[PDB]
Symmetry: D2
Subunit: 237 residues, 4 copies
């Protein structure tokens, strides 16, 4: 019953529910079955960067994921957010593990959104930038197994003291302030988000992924959304 | 009980409790009795601009209020905010009326805070900008008589359908997200705020004024803070 | 000989050389014959706003022109600018008049360009903002009849002491610093520009229009570019 | 005959011309004999960061220099730039060697300046950010021995192929666009600059230093300004 728009960094192929058979990035509009995907050549244990852009002139959502010294993977999709999301939203990061597992570490996150009235041609804007997360990060709403402050990082899913990821974990971090995403079909916010992430797995099989998401302001982790549902969806429809 | 740092635009001289005998701007550190003031040549019914700045290098809090084509009033005070404020705060705008009254209309409000930590030398930052306020402004916490949306403005205190301000009114607006305002592990910490305001009075004499304030995150309007205490303080100590 | 990418606000239909039979906005890639146009419901004597955006992810150049309380006109074109422009460029504003005329008054101009390089993932950036122009605006290179300082504005084309625009006029303003607009070693490259403009005509018909352009750094007004060529092109090829 | 305001990072004590007897940071107003200094505990071969701020409300120039995991050195000085500098300036970085020597490597440089008319309460602003310098850095004016592009860095003074600094070297880098620093005593720009630097010396005696400076737009390296004059002054008056 939540409304979700997300960019997923999907590390585990769930072909039974429409994943491609390889790690991929995807654009999810109200469904874990991505509207568009691109192959992702994941590098275990290297810091990656994700960049997400929504152009309100073209109403086009795009995402680029890359590592230093490697090609990027890119995916783009036409979507009118004014016709999918409520007027006010929260933005967040989500991750999960299932039978297989991985660290889901966020080293930094920034976000910018601008909403320009055509009434006044003046602009409301929100910008935030995390380059360090503290043990008491009061401007984040943490959900599930998410924690902050270990080495200054945000750990979205559970990691034991020895440093090993745990399976069957789900966690999210939403920015405290709601975001005004649209006022009309003619007035929709432009925004961009960037985060750096570190996904490590002991097994040859990391799972399940990280996502940047946009939700209704009161969104919470859906029941049974560990594993392939990325902490985002109550089912695989 | 609340911890308050404020810049006041004090329109009504309460000489009983330390006010000079003229409209003034003042720096308030945990008391309504300002640590420093400057005379403010108030112009009834003209849009004004207030600019507030602090950086941890000067450790100097300053404010400027001005109108188009007029001399500005400036006030400064040396103060070490990490010894005054809690680490996490909320920021906001407050206003009140008493026996005498005025409109306390906010046309725009922006704020930036930056924390640059001591050895990664990276930056945590928050920036917001309101050039319009709507009737359901979800990124603002409204307290007391504050309302939004009438002509796209924020009305801190009660105004009738006439456009007529009311006495004994008090209202505040706080930005939804807490702000990490200092960290004793930061090379530089700094913030700045700007707002534009319209204060109209039918009377010979406007009252009581507008303040930008910084507070503990769970700050609420103190009992008995209408009038001269500007919705900020429980008493005049 | 110059290399030009421009967004034109074309006020005068030159159907002889490919213009539609109405005022329009167009995307120009190395020719005055626009790759894409949209109809522009011009309002004589009202302040307009133009917004131009490009990012290397969409590789899509878009522009929007609008007035307060009116439908905006939008035009977009898929284009790979690293295959069109030199690596270093200057950015600027151009305008002209011909047999018919108009004022080509710029009230404000801002621009941001960002280059994020492929493996440090760091950012090189330039941002400037003009909300006032003075008589000796040293960060602008003025060409032809362009002047600054009259009522704090930039007059791209010749206006008499009357406030009366003149025919056969051409003028440009380029920002002093060259811009590193693409690097084939960048993850993301992007820019955006905004300006506000006032076009007044005594005539039935205004001419000839205003453009935001991107050029080789040593770009100058081509011989014979007054009127329909907007001070941008040597011919109508 | 140039007019110079600078923040110096002075690595070599020239006590004969008023240096303190230890490495220091200083604020120089039209003279190499700093108006104010603070002791600087320099770390050979570690990347340092310099942050410079001018507060136009207080008219106070401050500078902080630090290394990761170390205390910072700070210096502040009251100076009305409207009464010292011309209305338009260039900003730059300078360095020199003399009998003794050091690498004077710049790894990054950013600058922001805002000038707000009280006529319109609107703002002109310039921001630039270098996180990488290329071999052909067209938005920098290089003077003397300064070069760019080696490992993506700006080398202000001469370094041989083996990597060893050379004595008797002087070089500067000015940003291409002039900067509007003041319009009146009531209208002066606020600005801030940051750069990271790497000073290495083979000998126990590094010399002579790096400076952030503000000059007349046509400033050039003064004759005989190698060594203790930091490429800034024609003499030691
Ligand atoms: O291998 C068959 C199988 C897998 N799973 C589990 O592991 C997967 C990877 O962690 C998850 O995608 C999935 O949701 C489930 O938790 N349950 N059965
Ligand atoms: O004149 C007697 C008198 C009245 N008040 C009232 O009105 C003042 C102006 O609004 C307020 O400052 C004050 O707090 C009180 O409400 N204070 N003293
Ligand atoms: O009507 C005949 C005619 C006149 N012109 C002139 O005026 C036009 C409108 O200003 C310009 O577009 C054109 O380039 C020329 O200067 N072009 N055709
Ligand atoms: O040691 C005495 C002496 C020094 N210098 C030289 O070396 C110094 C350090 O490089 C410079 O400060 C000085 O300007 C000069 O070049 N000339 N004589
Ligand atoms: Mn999956
Ligand atoms: Mn998937
Ligand atoms: Mn008072
Ligand atoms: Mn007072
Ligand atoms: Mn035309
Ligand atoms: Mn045309
Ligand atoms: Mn010296
Ligand atoms: Mn010195």
């Amino acid at each position: 019953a939540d409304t979700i728009v997300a960019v997923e960094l999907d590390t585990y192929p769930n072909t039974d529910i429409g994943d491609p058979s390889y790690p991929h990035i995807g654009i999810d509009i109200k469904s874990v079955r991505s509207k568009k995907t691109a192959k992702w050549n994941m590098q275990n244990g290297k810091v990656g960067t994700a960049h997400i852009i929504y152009n309100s002139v073209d109403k086009r959502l795009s995402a680029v994921v890359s590592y230093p010294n490697a090609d990027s993977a890119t995916v783009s999709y036409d979507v009118d957010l004014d016709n999918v999301l409520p007027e006010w939203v929260r933005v967040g990061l989500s991750a999960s593990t299932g039978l297989y597992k991985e660290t889901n570490t966020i080293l930094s996150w920034s976000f910018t959104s601008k909403l320009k009235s055509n009434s006044t041609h003046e602009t409301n804007a929100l910008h935030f930038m995390f380059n360090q997360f503290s043990k008491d990060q009061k401007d984040l709403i943490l959900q599930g197994d998410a924690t902050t402050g270990t080495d200054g990082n945000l750990e979205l899913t559970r990691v034991s003291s020895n440093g090993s990821p745990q399976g069957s974990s789900v966690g999210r971090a939403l920015f405290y302030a709601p975001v005004h995403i649209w006022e009309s079909s003619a007035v929709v916010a432009s925004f961009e988000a960037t985060f750096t992430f570190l996904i490590k797995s002991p097994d040859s099989h990391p799972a399940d992924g990280i996502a940047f998401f946009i939700s209704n302001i009161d969104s919470s982790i859906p029941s049974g959304s560990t594993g392939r549902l990325l902490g985002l969806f109550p089912d695989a429809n």
